[PDB]
Design a protein around this ligand. Sequence first.
Ligand SMILES: Cc1cc2nc3c(=O)[nH]c(=O)nc-3n(C[C@H](O)[C@H](O)[C@H](O)COP(=O)(O)OP(=O)(O)OC[C@H]3O[C@@H](n4cnc5c(N)ncnc54)[C@H](O)[C@@H]3O)c2cc1C
Ligand SMILES: [Cl-]
Length: 583
Amino acid sequence: NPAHDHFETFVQAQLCQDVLSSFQGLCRALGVESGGGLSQYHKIKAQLNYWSAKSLWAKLDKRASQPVYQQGQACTNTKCLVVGAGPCGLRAAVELALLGARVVLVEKRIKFSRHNVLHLWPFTIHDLRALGAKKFYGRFCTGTLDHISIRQLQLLLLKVALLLGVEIHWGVKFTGLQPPPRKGSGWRAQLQPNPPAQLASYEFDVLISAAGGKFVPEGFTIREMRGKLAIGITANFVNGRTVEETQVPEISGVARIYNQKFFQSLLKATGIDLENIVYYKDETHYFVMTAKKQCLLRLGVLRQDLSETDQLLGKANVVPEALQRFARAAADFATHGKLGKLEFAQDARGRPDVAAFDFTSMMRAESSARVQEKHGARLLLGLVGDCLVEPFWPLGTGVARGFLAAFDAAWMVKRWAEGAGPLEVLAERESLYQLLSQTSPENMHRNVAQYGLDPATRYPNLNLRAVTPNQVQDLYDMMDSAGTEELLHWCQEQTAGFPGVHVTDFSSSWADGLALCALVHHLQPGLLQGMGALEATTWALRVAEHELGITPVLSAQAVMAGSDPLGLIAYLSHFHSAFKNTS
Ligand SMILES: Cc1cc2nc3c(=O)[nH]c(=O)nc-3n(C[C@H](O)[C@H](O)[C@H](O)COP(=O)(O)OP(=O)(O)OC[C@H]3O[C@@H](n4cnc5c(N)ncnc54)[C@H](O)[C@@H]3O)c2cc1C
Ligand SMILES: [Cl-]
């Protein structure tokens, strides 16, 4: 039987190319075209009615039938480009596809090559337990196992995303946005190496960027923040799965709070000074440690004391042989030798798998979402995963906060598909974003099994109006109400003839306060240089109030920052209302 011979190969595939190989071999044996969407998910399960595999269809159909998605129609008029086939990219891709949306994902690499091990919060375990991971990965969180290697997380999620009919492409980097030439024309992706001509023509109205710690799309800004110099070191050793190795208790890291006698012993015993060390028993014996610069220099792990941290941990300044020595001795002391002699696993390049990372930064994007609109054509952009907020690896928030963000973005595209105003969608979304960087299992909802896209199911005492529509206008970039153009033409008419006033808009035009003075001076002749925009703005607001009867809608600061156009429009409307030509 050809059918689910393929399907068993597909399920147990450990290599990206083979998952891909298998699926399109399963598809051919079924008359199903790969790239989906749900319609092709349907014909797959409806033509493969074999035991052991039904367990999986039950799990997926269980999630697929829960009200939020309705029945894959919530987002049928929604077309997405998802960037990044990382875990958060795939996890979000699955939600979009379950929502019924057309999901096309682009990934720059062609293999899952990372072997570092991620901590999984209890809810993510449930979440992907119920996506059928146990079947795609036998060792998935067996017993009290709390973690999963990056590439295994990807092998799972890929298989789920493929099944659900996500059109995925490999070996193609999203470079930027190629905007609409004209109404009716949509947004497209700039891709490279320049894609096939149908991907090239693919027009979308939602972009979800899950591209990892170093790539955010245009217009998204990054708030950088740096703590004390902090050097992270990960390492993977061959885990032979002998009974002896299997008994070595793993090290959680929370012991740095409860146990510092250890770090003293480590230091005395090896000359190694760590701030923390973590050990997970996974496909490899995984260690991540945090080290003091002084310590790494003294041990010849780093060649020279370099001030620019990116050059401090550049290839030229990291001594491979000494780093290996360093990691080996630390791993060995911490597990008291019970792992036997440690042999480095290979990384994907084929090197002893040990690397140093900058752990100093606390990056967050300023917002989780924005909306661009040109020639009436709207594009919702949503951040997910490491690119949104950077995880502190020793504390294991990466998967969980990436997943929370992926649910919040799918929830966002649901509002977007309901027809909500861009400001409303953004405000709601930024209200959720606010909570992300302080989430813990402890301050979240207790019942992880009842978790769904609805943020209420996840965040206790949820305030969906923490950020208001007025506070996210700079997130809505309208670079393309007919009463606004009346107001504008009228405002321009009033302030005409003033040296260095040129009313052009309802933000930057009015920022230095001279526009306001002109308006007032014009409206009441005979009242009253180089004081700042602050004094100009202020006089105008006081004089408007007392002479013209119009109280301030915006503060002076808000006039100068120009980030509240709607409120300036409402201010100005009072002047026009008060002094319209006639009735
Ligand atoms: C080398 C490396 C080692 C790590 N080690 C640990 C660890 O030890 N412990 C821990 O807790 N976390 C670790 N992390 C972070 C962890 O991998 C992520 O939190 C987790 O995978 C979820 O992140 P993500 O999907 O948002 O981003 P990522 O995992 O970075 O995935 C981003 C995806 O986007 C692809 N991509 C990037 N740019 C583009 C582009 N322009 N166009 C198209 N595709 C693009 C990338 O190839 C990648 O596949 C590591 C990350 C990296 C990159
Ligand atoms: Cl692979």
